[PDB]
Structure of Nuclear receptor subfamily 4 group A member 1:
Amino acid sequence: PANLLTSLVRAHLDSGPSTAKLDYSKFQELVLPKEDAGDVQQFYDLLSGSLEVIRKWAEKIPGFAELSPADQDLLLESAFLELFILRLAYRSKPGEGKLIFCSGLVLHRLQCARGFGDWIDSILAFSRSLHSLLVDVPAFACLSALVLITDRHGLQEPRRVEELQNRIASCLKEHVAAVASCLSRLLGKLPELRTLCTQGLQRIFYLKLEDLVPPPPIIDKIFMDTLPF
């Protein structure tokens, strides 16, 4: 409620690194000298490292594991990119151009530019926007989940998904009160995140075109399954 809020916060905090487990051993703000294979492999590796994490996170959202297994998979697949972006934007420090990934790895914007292309700048723009509204951890823990638990084409039980969504929206609304002016400002971030998911699909397309390094099968599936055509 309640305990829902608590369960949500706990799932969120368990899915990321501790401030103590941040890894700076590879961080370099200075880069010497377009995409090569090393950049493309790291792009896919960073994407890949979120998917087991985001899957273990979702399993801990109360109600999620009692959606049908096919609806679990569809929701995870459809939201992966958005969740990767949102959690990265929240985690990172755009004032310093610092990306912090869910493994604890810290990289500088220009260590990532080659692999990600312009998308990483747009992610950084979203991150500074997200930071300006100072979303506290409980609110974020709800928002995150609402990105996952939302209508998608092909759901077997769209109403049960809608029920769990309303439960989470309800939980969020209250928390914001306990602390929809600044709520609808919050929810205003979700459409922008969609637009960022698109830029991500555009980047994967370009790299599949380029074909230096192939995408790993499960990223490829997400790409193929999320093309609505």
In short: The radius of gyration is 17 Å. The domain at 1-229 is CATH 1.10.565.10 (Retinoid X Receptor). The longest strand covers residues 98-100. DSSP finds ten helices and two strands in the chain.
